[PDB]
Amino acid sequence: PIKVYGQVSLNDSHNQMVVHWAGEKSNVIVALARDSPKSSDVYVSYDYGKSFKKISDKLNFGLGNRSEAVIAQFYHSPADNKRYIFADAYAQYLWITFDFCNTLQGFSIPFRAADLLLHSKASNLLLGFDRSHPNKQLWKSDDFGQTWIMIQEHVKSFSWGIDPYDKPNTIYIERHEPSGYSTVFRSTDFFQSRENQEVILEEVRDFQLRDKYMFATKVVHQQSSVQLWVSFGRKPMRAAQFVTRHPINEYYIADASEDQVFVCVSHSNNRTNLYISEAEGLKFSLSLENVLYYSPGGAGSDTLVRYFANEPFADFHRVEGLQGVYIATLINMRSVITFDKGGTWEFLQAPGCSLHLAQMPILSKESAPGLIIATGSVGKKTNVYISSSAGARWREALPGPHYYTWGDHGGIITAIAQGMETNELKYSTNEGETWKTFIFSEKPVFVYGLLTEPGEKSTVFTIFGSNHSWLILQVNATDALGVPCTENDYKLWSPSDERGNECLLGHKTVFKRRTPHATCFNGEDFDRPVVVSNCSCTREDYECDFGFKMSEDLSLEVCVPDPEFSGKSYSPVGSTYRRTRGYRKISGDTCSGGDVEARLEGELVP
Ligand SMILES: *[C@@H]1O[C@H](CO)[C@@H](O)[C@H](O)[C@H]1NC(C)=O
Ligand SMILES: *[C@@H]1O[C@H](CO)[C@@H](O)[C@H](O)[C@H]1NC(C)=O
Ligand SMILES: *[C@@H]1O[C@H](CO)[C@@H](O)[C@H](O)[C@H]1NC(C)=O
């Protein structure tokens, strides 16, 4: 029903191992073994993981130099999955391949390659940032790392532009300056001429680019305070309004991907406050207080929080595949979820008790709309919890901590116990309502990774671990799904909140998906909603207005005046101006008509 078709032990005793399939239409897998750096090894499969060949000896410093290569990091081009760069940890040196590591060539380079930033569309183009010097130099290559020019020195921060919003080759940069105040510049010819260069904002402290938005900071006064500046869709930057009684030291941009900005301000007692804007990103309202926040700390002069997306400091998580849905943890903790980008929040429940989600991460994808797997616990021992209702309802799927992944649009889910040795793969074809066991090897292993072969329809899983000696297995589970799904095996589904509203963000979205109990191969792409239709407005289409905050008791769902406004939340006796009741329609909400829209919307006042 399921078979292990590839199993390979690498006579290798490094303490880290990463394994990456080249991509969806590809038989190549690259594996990199590293320490915690003291040594490394590289292995490549050209047969879907049936066999791996050691190719570390191809990574050498050339004729008459025998000193061993030590790979810190490798990089895969997202524009061309045949291309890789392996960077030496110590020497100023790279190896590049254009053919899945069949041929590698070494190149000595004028900096150590701490961080390379490969362009997402132009496969020859990349940046390199020399972080070892305090001299802070940005290097650019247009031949995939063979030759490099130094395009900017004294770099405080920089970023590639983003398509489609920026012209081709766009780079944004800000330099360190003796005064501490600096200019954000944009160039389309790598800073080679005045004519292809543009001032974006001046007297800036920091800057960041995130999707359609750009953020920068200035200082105002009389204690000084940091003012946030924002651009939406590459229009000129404008000052955001953040009214508080006390100085703001920094902003954390938590998310800017759904036509609004979530921003966190303050980090007292490992808590922060979550604010949301409308589309322009300029008028923020307090959506959620006391969100868990843990950072390692920084030098003390950062005004925009730097962090990696896969390691957010705020316990706040966008659910993929769905607009509107985010999950957070607040504080004696509680997990909450929103279905309307922070307009209202609800407590998560399992069978009911309060469900607390440790964010082992939350797994969700556009290829399986409404399916979420997460790790957490109930009351007061971690288990695996599953929702197939976009987080509205949850069940406990498996007890104990596990790796989990899935294939074929969520139609087959796999799980392996973590933190103990095992030779057991759990699999479910019904969203975790039942599970079968497949013994994937005779002897137990500590498992360190569980992956799905890329491709939305894939039903091949990679397992790697050891008992130190690395083992890599490939499990083909295709036959566990049997024959192709037919019309009988699909049902219409609309995401809803916990109350049953299938009307989210002012419209009803309809997906065609495979029923929970159908055992069949789903060969269809139904990732994109079949029907969308508008609804009459409800409370759920509204959020707190500038000057207001969510009631402390979230279940009241009432917006009240924010004390930070010092009693001036409602300030303008003439004409017919529009006085807010505390609410504004959520950015991108398409609701229309009905009772609620009236007297949630502003009041006409003389
Ligand atoms: C070999 O060449 C590399 C890269 O140029 C250099 O960094 C290293 O010092 C060399 N090692 C020896 C033993 O000559
Ligand atoms: C897995 O099994 C299916 C059905 O037998 C086959 O079509 C598919 O190519 C296999 N995949 C791999 C990577 O062996
Ligand atoms: C729903 O409303 C939006 C504007 O709010 C409009 O653009 C869209 O055409 C409407 N869609 C449907 C399917 O009626």
Side-chain angles (χ1 to χ4, degrees):
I2 295 187
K3 73 167 304 207
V4 181
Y5 70 87
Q7 50 177 311
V8 172
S9 49
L10 310 171
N11 178 22
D12 179 296
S13 52
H14 298 92
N15 61 59
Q16 288 188 359
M17 168 70 83
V18 303
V19 179
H20 290 283
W21 285 77
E24 176 177 7
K25 290 313 199 179
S26 182
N27 53 310
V28 173
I29 303 176
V30 180
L32 169 59
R34 285 172 309 195
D35 297 321
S36 49
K38 295 176 69 173
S39 64
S40 66
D41 271 300
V42 175
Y43 311 83
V44 69
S45 169
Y46 293 111
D47 57 13
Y48 306 91
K50 249 193 299 316
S51 66
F52 277 86
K53 170 156 67 65
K54 199 170 184 204
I55 60 162
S56 314
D57 61 345
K58 288 197 195 151
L59 298 156
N60 59 65
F61 296 103
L63 301 188
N65 179 335
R66 283 173 195 76
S67 40
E68 212 165 79
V70 178
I71 307 307
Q73 172 63 326
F74 81 118
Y75 301 90
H76 191 207
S77 169
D80 176 356
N81 69 352
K82 292 164 268 137
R83 303 201 169 189
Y84 300 75
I85 301 182
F86 302 78
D88 193 84
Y90 299 129
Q92 296 174 358
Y93 205 92
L94 298 179
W95 294 266
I96 82 196
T97 175
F98 298 110
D99 58 358
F100 295 118
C101 308
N102 191 54
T103 304
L104 282 148
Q105 196 173 11
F107 289 90
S108 84
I109 53 161
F111 56 104
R112 213 172 48 77
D115 197 21
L116 296 186
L117 297 101
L118 286 54
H119 198 279
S120 64
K121 300 287 180 273
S123 63
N124 281 325
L125 200 52
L126 67 162
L127 292 178
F129 189 43
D130 187 357
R131 220 201 283 97
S132 65
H133 307 181
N135 180 34
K136 299 305 190 286
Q137 303 187 301
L138 183 57
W139 294 83
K140 173 268 196 159
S141 178
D142 196 32
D143 46 37
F144 206 52
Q146 297 178 28
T147 71
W148 290 96
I149 58 162
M150 205 281 293
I151 61 166
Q152 199 74 183
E153 194 177 75
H154 297 161
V155 170
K156 173 161 189 182
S157 83
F158 71 91
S159 173
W160 277 122
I162 309 176
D163 204 69
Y165 322 113
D166 297 298
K167 288 175 190 182
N169 301 332
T170 294
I171 294 165
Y172 287 90
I173 209 140
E174 175 195 349
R175 295 201 299 280
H176 288 285
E177 296 297 346
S179 73
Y181 288 82
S182 174
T183 294
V184 181
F185 285 102
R186 165 166 77 204
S187 166
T188 56
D189 68 5
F190 312 103
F191 306 93
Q192 300 306 311
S193 67
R194 299 204 82 240
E195 76 187 348
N196 298 125
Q197 166 167 312
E198 193 176 357
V199 168
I200 302 302
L201 200 60
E202 298 185 326
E203 316 299 345
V204 165
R205 293 290 287 145
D206 291 285
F207 120 84
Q208 290 183 0
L209 196 155
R210 265 155 80 88
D211 302 313
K212 283 175 208 178
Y213 294 88
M214 275 191 293
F215 303 93
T217 58
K218 304 201 194 180
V219 174
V220 292
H221 302 68
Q222 329 90 24
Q223 338 187 43
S224 68
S225 191
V226 181
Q227 183 188 53
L228 188 64
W229 284 62
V230 187
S231 165
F232 178 55
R234 298 310 180 264
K235 294 187 162 160
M237 301 205 59
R238 308 216 271 125
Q241 286 180 77
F242 252 94
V243 179
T244 64
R245 285 162 296 190
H246 304 295
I248 296 176
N249 295 332
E250 60 182 348
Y251 299 85
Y252 170 96
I253 312 303
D255 173 73
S257 63
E258 318 182 358
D259 303 318
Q260 72 186 47
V261 183
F262 296 79
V263 181
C264 299
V265 174
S266 209
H267 54 244
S268 314
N269 299 285
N270 296 117
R271 296 150 166 78
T272 185
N273 291 322
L274 180 75
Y275 293 76
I276 60 179
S277 75
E278 289 293 329
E280 290 307 319
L282 298 174
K283 299 175 86 193
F284 287 87
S285 63
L286 180 46
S287 171
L288 195 58
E289 288 174 74
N290 299 317
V291 172
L292 263 204
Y293 188 80
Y294 183 69
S295 81
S301 65
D302 268 18
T303 62
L304 288 173
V305 182
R306 302 172 152 237
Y307 66 92
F308 311 97
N310 56 42
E311 269 104 36
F313 297 167
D315 215 329
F316 168 86
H317 194 267
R318 166 166 62 77
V319 175
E320 295 165 46
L322 297 166
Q323 295 294 117
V325 188
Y326 295 79
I327 296 166
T329 300
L330 57 80
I331 188 177
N332 191 241
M333 301 168 192
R334 297 292 188 284
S335 303
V336 296
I337 185 163
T338 180
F339 298 87
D340 61 351
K341 300 184 203 179
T344 61
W345 293 88
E346 297 128 279
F347 296 92
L348 285 191
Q349 316 200 300
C353 281
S354 279
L355 174 62
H356 315 293
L357 296 181
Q359 293 191 31
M360 268 286 98
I362 291 171
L363 187 50
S364 75
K365 303 284 182 186
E366 282 179 359
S367 59
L371 178 66
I372 316 177
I373 309 184
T375 304
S377 59
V378 169
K380 256 151 185 166
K381 215 279 164 158
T382 80
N383 307 307
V384 177
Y385 294 86
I386 295 191
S387 178
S388 71
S389 50
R393 291 171 304 286
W394 293 87
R395 62 197 171 281
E396 180 180 348
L398 294 166
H402 284 79
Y403 296 93
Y404 37 84
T405 185
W406 73 61
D408 192 31
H409 298 284
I412 185 146
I413 301 176
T414 62
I416 298 175
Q418 65 139 296
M420 56 183 55
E421 294 204 313
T422 178
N423 65 338
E424 290 184 358
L425 173 63
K426 294 282 174 64
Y427 72 95
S428 169
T429 60
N430 56 21
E431 298 168 350
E433 294 175 13
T434 54
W435 295 88
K436 287 187 185 57
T437 302
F438 170 73
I439 307 298
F440 61 79
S441 95
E442 317 199 63
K443 257 154 195 282
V445 297
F446 286 89
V447 171
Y448 287 110
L450 166 62
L451 313 168
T452 308
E453 174 179 11
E456 292 189 17
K457 283 184 288 182
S458 308
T459 55
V460 166
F461 305 91
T462 302
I463 297 165
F464 61 92
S466 84
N467 40 86
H468 206 120
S469 169
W470 294 92
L471 182 83
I472 309 181
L473 314 172
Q474 317 296 333
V475 176
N476 196 338
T478 307
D479 297 347
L481 286 176
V483 297
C485 297
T486 58
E487 277 314 298
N488 295 322
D489 305 313
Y490 298 93
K491 169 210 168 67
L492 301 184
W493 173 79
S494 279
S496 64
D497 61 24
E498 287 176 18
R499 276 194 217 164
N501 269 70
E502 323 189 315
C503 265
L504 300 175
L505 295 178
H507 46 271
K508 186 170 160 178
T509 309
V510 177
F511 296 90
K512 189 163 171 172
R513 50 183 215 177
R514 201 271 256 160
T515 54
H517 301 144
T519 305
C520 53
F521 192 84
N522 175 6
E524 295 295 327
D525 184 359
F526 290 142
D527 294 0
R528 293 185 214 282
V530 296
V531 180
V532 185
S533 300
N534 296 325
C535 301
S536 91
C537 303
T538 80
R539 168 55 184 95
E540 191 75 8
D541 301 290
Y542 287 85
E543 69 188 54
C544 301
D545 195 2
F546 174 71
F548 296 78
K549 69 175 171 179
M550 176 56 57
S551 50
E552 184 173 17
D553 173 354
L554 295 179
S555 70
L556 309 181
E557 303 191 350
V558 48
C559 295
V560 300
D562 188 327
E564 290 291 337
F565 276 67
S566 299
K568 82 205 174 290
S569 295
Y570 298 89
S571 304
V573 178
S575 290
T576 68
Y577 76 106
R578 217 60 173 273
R579 192 189 190 266
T580 184
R581 335 192 81 123
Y583 297 87
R584 65 193 169 178
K585 191 159 290 193
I586 295 162
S587 171
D589 192 289
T590 63
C591 78
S592 195
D595 193 11
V596 177
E597 196 168 31
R599 317 199 341 195
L600 274 196
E601 75 187 24
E603 185 195 9
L604 283 176
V605 174

